[PDB]
Design a protein around this motif. Structure first.
Motif, PDB file in Angstrom:
ATOM      1  N   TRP A 285       0.821  -1.214   0.000  1.00  0.00           N
ATOM      2  CA  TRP A 285       0.000   0.000   0.000  1.00  0.00           C
ATOM      3  C   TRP A 285       0.859   1.270   0.000  1.00  0.00           C
ATOM      4  CZ3 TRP A 285      -4.454   1.924  -1.320  1.00  0.00           C
ATOM      5  CH2 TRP A 285      -4.905   3.142  -0.768  1.00  0.00           C
ATOM      6  N   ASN A 286       1.993   1.218   0.701  1.00  0.00           N
ATOM      7  CA  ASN A 286       2.957   2.323   0.742  1.00  0.00           C
ATOM      8  C   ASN A 286       3.701   2.518  -0.583  1.00  0.00           C
ATOM      9  OD1 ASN A 286       2.419   1.808   3.720  1.00  0.00           O
ATOM     10  ND2 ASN A 286       3.851   3.531   3.877  1.00  0.00           N
TER      11      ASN A 286
ATOM     12  N   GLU B 121       2.082   1.831  -3.395  1.00  0.00           N
ATOM     13  CA  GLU B 121       0.969   2.437  -4.130  1.00  0.00           C
ATOM     14  C   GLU B 121       0.789   3.908  -3.739  1.00  0.00           C
ATOM     15  OE1 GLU B 121      -0.940  -0.199  -6.195  1.00  0.00           O
ATOM     16  OE2 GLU B 121      -0.969   1.689  -7.310  1.00  0.00           O
ATOM     17  N   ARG B 122       1.192   4.244  -2.510  1.00  0.00           N
ATOM     18  CA  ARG B 122       1.227   5.625  -2.019  1.00  0.00           C
ATOM     19  C   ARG B 122       2.299   6.450  -2.748  1.00  0.00           C
ATOM     20  NH1 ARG B 122       0.253   7.048   4.325  1.00  0.00           N
ATOM     21  NH2 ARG B 122      -1.890   6.888   3.526  1.00  0.00           N
ATOM     22  N   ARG B 123       3.411   5.797  -3.099  1.00  0.00           N
ATOM     23  CA  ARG B 123       4.502   6.409  -3.874  1.00  0.00           C
ATOM     24  C   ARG B 123       4.066   6.877  -5.265  1.00  0.00           C
ATOM     25  NH1 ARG B 123       7.569   5.853   0.451  1.00  0.00           N
ATOM     26  NH2 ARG B 123       9.812   5.455   0.216  1.00  0.00           N
TER      27      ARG B 123
ATOM     28  N   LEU C 238       1.092   8.021  -5.908  1.00  0.00           N
ATOM     29  CA  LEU C 238       0.368   9.252  -5.592  1.00  0.00           C
ATOM     30  C   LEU C 238       1.318  10.368  -5.157  1.00  0.00           C
ATOM     31  CD1 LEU C 238      -2.177   7.365  -3.332  1.00  0.00           C
ATOM     32  CD2 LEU C 238      -2.944   8.413  -5.476  1.00  0.00           C
ATOM     33  N   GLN C 239       2.355   9.999  -4.398  1.00  0.00           N
ATOM     34  CA  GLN C 239       3.316  10.938  -3.805  1.00  0.00           C
ATOM     35  C   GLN C 239       4.061  11.776  -4.854  1.00  0.00           C
ATOM     36  OE1 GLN C 239       7.112   9.796  -1.883  1.00  0.00           O
ATOM     37  NE2 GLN C 239       6.214  10.390   0.088  1.00  0.00           N
TER      38      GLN C 239
ATOM     39  N   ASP D 162       1.747  14.039  -6.765  1.00  0.00           N
ATOM     40  CA  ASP D 162       1.343  15.200  -5.961  1.00  0.00           C
ATOM     41  C   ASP D 162       2.362  16.341  -6.020  1.00  0.00           C
ATOM     42  OD1 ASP D 162      -1.255  14.487  -4.969  1.00  0.00           O
ATOM     43  OD2 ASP D 162      -0.333  13.191  -3.462  1.00  0.00           O
TER      44      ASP D 162
END
Lengths: 69, 80
Positions: A48-49, A51-53, A55-56, A59
């Motif tokens: 999940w982290n 997958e957060r990358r 988005l990161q 952003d």
């Protein structure tokens, strides 16, 4: 005829019987589920982290793209 | 064994929680050095920009193009 209190025992209620016994948990088997949940825990969380990358970076890219701001 | 096998079952019997204080904290130092996965996490930390990227003047430069999607520089695409 004489009527008095009658004696009855039948089953004798079982004189001192153990009720406490080992149930569900055995010992070594609980560690296989215990530490097994931990190894499943980290592997599910870290994906999940990653997958957060996705988005990161996307952003922070918005700030670089916006120069009229 | 005089210290490996002898001072193991006694530690599990007398003060059993002290086994976890040395094992978990001990492996917390060993694992980030030997396992080949820590090198990947360092790259994404540096790739994600905090501030706006600076533009350099073009005078004989390699692996540098326009802002549009093209094969230039590094640009991270590790694991999807």
């Amino acid at each position: 005829x004489x009527x008095x209190x009658x004696x009855x025992x039948x089953x004798x209620x079982x004189x001192x019987x153990x009720x406490x016994x080992x149930x569900x948990x055995x010992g070594y088997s609980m560690f296989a589920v215990g530490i097994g949940a931990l190894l499943f825990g980290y592997w599910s969380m870290m994906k999940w982290n990653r997958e957060r990358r996705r988005l990161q970076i996307e952003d922070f890219e918005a700030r670089i793209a916006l120069m009229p701001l | 064994a005089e210290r490996v096998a002898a001072f193991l079952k006694n530690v599990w019997a007398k003060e059993p929680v002290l086994v976890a204080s040395f094992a978990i904290a001990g492996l917390a130092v060993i694992l980030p050095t030997l396992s080949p996965y820590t090198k990947y996490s360092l790259m994404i930390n540096x790739x994600x920009x905090x501030x706006x990227x600076x533009x350099x003047x073009x005078x004989x430069x390699x692996x540098x193009x326009x802002x549009x999607x093209x094969x230039x520089x590094x640009x991270x695409x590790x694991x999807x």
